[PDB]
Design a protein around this motif. Structure first.
Motif, PDB file in Angstrom:
ATOM      1  N   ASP A  24       0.847  -1.175   0.000  1.00 29.00           N
ATOM      2  CA  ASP A  24       0.000   0.000   0.000  1.00 29.00           C
ATOM      3  C   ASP A  24       0.893   1.239   0.000  1.00 29.00           C
ATOM      4  O   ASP A  24       1.435   1.625   1.037  1.00 29.00           O
TER       5      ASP A  24
ATOM      6  N   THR B 154      -0.115   4.358   2.562  1.00 28.14           N
ATOM      7  CA  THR B 154       0.126   4.216   3.999  1.00 28.14           C
ATOM      8  C   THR B 154       1.546   3.743   4.278  1.00 28.14           C
ATOM      9  O   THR B 154       2.291   4.405   4.995  1.00 28.14           O
ATOM     10  N   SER B 155       1.914   2.603   3.698  1.00 24.09           N
ATOM     11  CA  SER B 155       3.183   1.958   4.000  1.00 24.09           C
ATOM     12  C   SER B 155       3.840   1.380   2.744  1.00 24.09           C
ATOM     13  O   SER B 155       3.691   0.205   2.457  1.00 24.09           O
TER      14      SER B 155
ATOM     15  N   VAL C 185       6.263  -1.688   3.304  1.00 25.50           N
ATOM     16  CA  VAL C 185       5.718  -2.823   4.045  1.00 25.50           C
ATOM     17  C   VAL C 185       4.839  -3.659   3.139  1.00 25.50           C
ATOM     18  O   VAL C 185       3.801  -3.192   2.689  1.00 25.50           O
TER      19      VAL C 185
ATOM     20  N   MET D  64       2.038  -6.335   2.017  1.00 24.21           N
ATOM     21  CA  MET D  64       0.741  -6.685   2.570  1.00 24.21           C
ATOM     22  C   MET D  64       0.269  -8.099   2.206  1.00 24.21           C
ATOM     23  O   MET D  64      -0.225  -8.846   3.058  1.00 24.21           O
TER      24      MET D  64
ATOM     25  N   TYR E  84       0.553  -7.011  10.281  1.00 19.12           N
ATOM     26  CA  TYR E  84       0.365  -5.838   9.437  1.00 19.12           C
ATOM     27  C   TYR E  84      -0.257  -4.702  10.219  1.00 19.12           C
ATOM     28  O   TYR E  84       0.110  -3.547  10.031  1.00 19.12           O
TER      29      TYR E  84
ATOM     30  N   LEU F 178       2.062  -2.826  12.420  1.00 20.06           N
ATOM     31  CA  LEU F 178       2.918  -1.922  11.668  1.00 20.06           C
ATOM     32  C   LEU F 178       2.147  -0.701  11.162  1.00 20.06           C
ATOM     33  O   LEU F 178       2.677   0.414  11.243  1.00 20.06           O
ATOM     34  N   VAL F 179       0.926  -0.883  10.641  1.00 19.10           N
ATOM     35  CA  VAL F 179       0.267   0.214   9.908  1.00 19.10           C
ATOM     36  C   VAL F 179      -0.978   0.802  10.542  1.00 19.10           C
ATOM     37  O   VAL F 179      -1.378   1.896  10.157  1.00 19.10           O
TER      38      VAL F 179
END
Ligand SMILES: [Zn+2]
Ligand SMILES: [Zn+2]
Lengths: 472, 473
Positions: free
Chosen positions: A133, A136-137, A140, A142, B218, B221-222
């Motif tokens: 994403d 947002t991140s 990272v 998903m 997840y 983290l977010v």
């Protein structure tokens, strides 16, 4: 996170596809779309998205890919692996906006960031899509769209290229690439979601989950394939016990490689009126498929017609038993004909010329119609003593080993069409399976070969065992 | 792994429910079932499952729970938290097979092993369900049915009890419990799935995700709530900018606590012939609800009827606008009437007496029918220079703050019913929103109050702003 994800599932093919999008910009894509793209287009519209690309994880062996159909109908980019050898390249996509993907390549739809991971094993070219994403991140991960690489509780079978495509020693080679590819998988963070291309009941693997998704972390702990540390040993495990390869898989690899015919080019099967007058020329004109319940099919059907009853198993047996190189005439109730046609089209049986409600068998001519007997085990047991019957067990090799009816012959339904000459036309043939599904279909094949006297054992081996009757 | 899990979703309410089962033994349960339990029973039958239990993660504020419905129709056990205070206890379940769950309790359905986690925050009694597969890996957790505790990219609002139930100081109290419960969450392995009770668009949270599930890893983290290390700051953050509490949430919290009426007890609304003669008795006999597109409604509708067009937003506005203490006469096309009734029932609008196709509007009597005008911005702008109109803006406060039409009056549709008296009956009322959906509903509400001359601005503020017409801040 203004990120949209939806899972579409075909219960018949056990096939999962995904629509992934950015709600801020609306750009979306579809991962391993079915041929019938309407549910995707319809959902995208409702949700205010626009499909701008269609991604294939691999060249599929079991269904016709809807990549081109999307290419055509939504103007989308055909996004496919270019990591296969020359013989597994999709050169047709070049006539479209397209992307020939390599390991590490990235696809961007608004905030949706996808990264390509070459993950050979199921197929040489196979690639999985790692999702981030970007809003947002962005760093990272998903979710992994794992295709037929890693499943829930299993991994893809590596032996399709050897079995349907005739590629010598490729099951071993691919089995080894599966082992290497799995190391890339476990290098991912445990939190990453795992979103495969198939589920429970697919012939693309040996024991898939009835749970739609997992996670890198969970699979590392529980998936049988990820507990192996010896490659030699893994190859061994992976090649043992895989299901039979449906014969039509060869056709799918070709069709999906070269570019499927567009549903608009085939057009609509027309709804014909079939008065008794027209029936013979209809029977003579091609293969007649009758999707009624066997119960009803057995009392009265068009001679030489084939019964694959409408249910979860339809497309499996359509695939095993119907040809692509012959026109199909369909008997089907008006309420379900469109669905049946779709299902046929989904596995590449394109040439369905017309259809009509199966009430057309009622007033049909004596020399146009036929029947077979639904019989009980009690009846079969009486015919046993003087050996009146020629018994046919159409179950799987493994069920037969655990016990069958006395003097029963074994031909599994998937193989019946080949060894049908082995069945005697003048004998009284009595056919059974576990519970009565496969046998019913087998019965329609037998009659169509020309076996005059055919019986089906209602309730099957379980009803027989149930009655305390003897087994060998 | 012979384990079955399926997610059902109500796009309207943004509510996720799950069917979980053991395919070896067939035993299954449903988590946070809708009131209409037919989809679960149907799916169970096709899959060779039998539903044995119904699990509630919490006493729901936005819809009617189908626990009882499932208890009656499948003989299932009602399985609900007993961790709340005395005033949030589901004591009706005692009349059924049932489990009054505590933290650390376990429910076993074949190889399906579920462990109860008390996770207060959204409500005091709230529980999440942790699932293990006892065939493959009995000590490895797989999924968390988080209810309205942790969403994808958010956590449940803690303020419904204070807003709808009159519980002073409870938002802050529960806010703090949410922070405490979040430490249990982050104690779970990163690989565990998060499967919540709601999704993007629900009033039960601030900013829920359009992605249907996540993972403990997840979210750690977010997810914004899981970055806060200070409890005071978290209470602040959590309480700010939470969406409006629909007034019917009070009714749901009651119904689900005391046990909802059984769909069979209500029966089926009759399909009725409505010739022009029968129209006046039907209009005076209750609340007439017409679910045609606004466009059509605006040209001809039964005077005093209310228009909530059939689309994704129906149930939102039904909930805001319709009473459950009055009988409802429905106008709906035959193709969709049953779905509309189901929708109404899902939020507790039970007394729907009868329905008919909206063609009954065509040949109606003149003293039974009304209309309102759909007008363009060009028209509204000409009536502006002479202040012919009384402009009503029905958008939310934050949209208003961005800019509105000149000399306009602000009443969001959510509040329009209460402040209706502030609208003048003899004025030329001209109503608008962002695009025209909400305004159409408002228009019907206005005409039903008795405002003779009502106009609706086609395209709303966007068409107006689009044409370069004047705005005010
Ligand atoms: Zn495959
Ligand atoms: Zn809630």
């Amino acid at each position: 996170n203004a990120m949209y994800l939806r899972r579409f599932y075909d219960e018949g093919l056990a096939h999962a596809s995904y629509l992934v999008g950015c709600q801020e910009t609306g750009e979306a894509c579809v991962i391993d779309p079915a041929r019938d793209v309407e549910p995707y287009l319809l959902t995208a519209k409702r949700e205010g998205l626009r499909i701008v690309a269609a991604l294939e994880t691999h060249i599929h062996a079991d269904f016709v890919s809807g990549a081109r159909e999307m290419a055509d109908r939504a103007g989308a980019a055909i996004c496919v692996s270019d990591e296969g050898p020359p013989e597994w390249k999709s050169e047709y996509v070049k006539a479209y906006p397209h992307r020939l993907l390599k390991d590490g390549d990235e696809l961007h739809f608004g905030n949706v960031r996808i990264v390509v991971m070459h993950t050979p094993g199921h197929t040489p070219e196979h690639v999985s899509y790692l999702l981030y994403d970007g809003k947002t991140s962005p760093d990272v991960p998903m979710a992994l769209f794992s295709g037929d690489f890693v499943f829930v509780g299993d991994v893809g079978r590596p032996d399709l290229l050897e079995r349907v495509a005739g590629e010598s020693g490729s099951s071993e080679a691919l089995a080894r690439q599966m082992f290497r590819s799995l190391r890339k998988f476990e290098a991912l963070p445990d939190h990453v979601q795992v979103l495969p291309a198939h589920g429970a009941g697919s012939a693309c693997g040996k024991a898939l989950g009835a749970v739609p998704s997992s996670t890198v972390g969970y699979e590392k702990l529980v998936n049988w394939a990820l507990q192996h540390k010896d490659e030699d040993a893994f190859v061994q495990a992976l090649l043992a016990g895989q299901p039979e390869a449906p014969i039509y898989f060869a056709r799918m690899k070709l069709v999906n490689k070269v570019g499927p015919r567009l549903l608009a080019e085939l057009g609509a099967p027309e709804r014909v009126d079939l008065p008794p007058e027209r029936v013979r020329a209809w029977r003579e004109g091609g293969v007649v498929l009758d999707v009624r319940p066997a119960d009803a099919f057995a009392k009265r059907h068009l001679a030489g017609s084939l019964n694959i009853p409408w249910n979860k198993s339809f497309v499996t047996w359509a695939g095993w038993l119907l040809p692509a190189d012959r026109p199909i005439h369909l008997l089907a109730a008006d309420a379900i004909a469109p669905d049946v046609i779709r299902a046929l089209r989904s596995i590449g049986i394109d040439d369905v010329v017309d259809w009509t409600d199966p009430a057309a068998v009622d007033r049909a001519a004596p020399d146009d119609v036929a029947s077979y007997a639904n019989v009980s085990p009690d009846e079969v047991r009486g015919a046993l003593a003087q050996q009146g019957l020629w018994l046919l067990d159409v179950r799987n090799v493994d069920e037969w080993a655990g016990g069958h009816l006395p003097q029963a012959h074994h031909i599994p339904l998937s193989k019946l069409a080949a060894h049908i000459h082995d069945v005697p036309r003048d004998g009284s043939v009595c056919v059974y399976c576990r519970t009565g599904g496969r046998s019913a279909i087998a019965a329609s094949l037998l009659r169509a070969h020309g076996v005059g006297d055919v019986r089906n054992m209602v309730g099957g081996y379980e009803a027989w065992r149930g009655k305390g009757f003897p087994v060998e």
